[PDB]
Amino acid sequence: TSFINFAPKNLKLLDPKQFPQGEILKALPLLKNESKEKNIFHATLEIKENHIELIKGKKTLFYTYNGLVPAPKIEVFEGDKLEILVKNKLKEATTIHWHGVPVPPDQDGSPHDPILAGEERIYRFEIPQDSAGTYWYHPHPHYTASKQVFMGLAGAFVIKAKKDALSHLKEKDLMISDLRLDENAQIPNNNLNDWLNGREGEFVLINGQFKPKIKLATNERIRIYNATAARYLNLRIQGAKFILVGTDGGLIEKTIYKEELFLSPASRVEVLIDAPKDGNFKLESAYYDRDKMMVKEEPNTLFLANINLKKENVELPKNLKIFKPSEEPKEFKEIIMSEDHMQMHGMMGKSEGELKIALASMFLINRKSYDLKRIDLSSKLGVVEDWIVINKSHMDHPFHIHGTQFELISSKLNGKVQKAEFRALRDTINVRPNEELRLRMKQDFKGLRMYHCHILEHEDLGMMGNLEVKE
Numbered sequence: 001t002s003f004i005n006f007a008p009k010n011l012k013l014l015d016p017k018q019f020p021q022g023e024i025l026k027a028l029p030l031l032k033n034e035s036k037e038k039n040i041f042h043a044t045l046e047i048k049e050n051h052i053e054l055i056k057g058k059k060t061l062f063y064t065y066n067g068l069v070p071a072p073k074i075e076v077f078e079g080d081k082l083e084i085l086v087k088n089k090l091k092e093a094t095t096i097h098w099h100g101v102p103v104p105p106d107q108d109g110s111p112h113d114p115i116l117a118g119e120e121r122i123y124r125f126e127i128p129q130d131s132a133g134t135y136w137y138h139p140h141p142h143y144t145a146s147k148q149v150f151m152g153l154a155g156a157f158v159i160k161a162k163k164d165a166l167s168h169l170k171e172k173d174l175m176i177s178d179l180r181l182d183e184n185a186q187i188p189n190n191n192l193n194d195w196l197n198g199r200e201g202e203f204v205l206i207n208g209q210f211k212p213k214i215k216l217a218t219n220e221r222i223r224i225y226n227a228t229a230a231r232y233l234n235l236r237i238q239g240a241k242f243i244l245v246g247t248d249g250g251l252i253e254k255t256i257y258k259e260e261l262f263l264s265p266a267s268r269v270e271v272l273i274d275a276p277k278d279g280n281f282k283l284e285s286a287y288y289d290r291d292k293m294m295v296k297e298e299p300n301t302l303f304l305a306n307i308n309l310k311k312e313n314v315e316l317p318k319n320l321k322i323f324k325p326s327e328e329p330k331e332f333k334e335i336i337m338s339e340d341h342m343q344m345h346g347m348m349g350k351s352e353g354e355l356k357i358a359l360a361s362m363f364l365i366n367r368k369s370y371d372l373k374r375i376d377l378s379s380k381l382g383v384v385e386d387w388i389v390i391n392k393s394h395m396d397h398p399f400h401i402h403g404t405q406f407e408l409i410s411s412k413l414n415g416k417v418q419k420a421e422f423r424a425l426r427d428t429i430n431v432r433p434n435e436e437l438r439l440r441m442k443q444d445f446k447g448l449r450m451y452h453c454h455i456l457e458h459e460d461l462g463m464m465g466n467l468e469v470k471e
């Protein structure tokens, strides 16, 4: 439990007036392709500490990809062949997980295959047909994923089709992260509440920028990334609506119109914005009560950014994407997410050391904590399965499974059933307290996969298991 560090008690945080704000939103920098061959993407990611003059007077220590905040975006096409050299220049082990991207387990940066401090690894994989979607990359080492993210390590990863219903549209990225700064402009350690609830950095950023001015138009294909450790968003633009056109694993069948867009941690969508006319709007997130513990919160709306919106009509087809007929499942899995508050009650009498033990045995899957060495579940290569994911705890947890996209079939809550509102492919899904979800998927590569809560602090505290995929 040496990975559990608590911030100083009554740590004072930075005054938000000191944080640069109100700037025009910039596009993410792209990770340069070192190769000139057709359909070949070659590049290098260095993972390193850097000191950034963000707050006047002060240098802020970040962990970065290629020394950049925000990180370089990877953008490739279906059918491309990728090779990325990754150099770990941190003083601790790390990995890169291509979150949601269908790659073989040995190319996917799980805590089984760490990159030690001072070493390097090459990741190599093909971009499959039909994999167009909106993904991201971030660390997944044992125990320290939450700190490495909160230090700055998260980047965009997009797979494009050579041609699809929206591929002629100009694109925009709204990559949403969050950042905590102390009174001396440094990124502090988690406190107890962050470990219990998942850490939410007070400064919520879009492409690394605080309260920016965004120029958008209604004929743009906008990718939105919830790249936070634990923050639930319920996005809205009063006076406008979202036209949902895609989820993690790409386009959906038909436009879905939404006044609010719920985006739990690690989820991504593609949207257009609809409004009747040109205008100036505000991007906000409505408070979502996720039953955080030891916190009484103001149910406040979070303001994220100003949007200057240009109205341009755009032709949208009747069908965005033709989905394959749903396949029949042949085996079934059950995932129970739960918590043990045996200990933690009597918070009052515990030393720092005993809180750490409590935290480490608290967040469970199928009544167990993560064991790096234990195979929890086994599935057959290429076989369609339904996974029944149930949340028996008092608080939301977003479920993630590596290696595949799944389709929500149906959900149940409070003794009632709701069939999915539309077919979509996701790799991460919120599970409400007492809710039961039915998720259809298959695994197309042999080897080990994890599945876990994607509130990063819960994952690091053991809310995770191992899946073995065999022939």
Ligand SMILES: [Cu+2]
Pocket: 097, 099, 138, 266, 400, 454
């Ligand atoms: Cu992830």
Ligand SMILES: [Cu+2]
Pocket: 097, 098, 099, 100, 400, 401, 402, 403
């Ligand atoms: Cu993942």
Ligand SMILES: [Cu+2]
Pocket: 097, 140, 400, 402, 450, 452
């Ligand atoms: Cu993971």
Ligand SMILES: [Cu+2]
Pocket: 363, 396, 397, 398, 453, 454, 455, 458, 459, 463
């Ligand atoms: Cu959780």
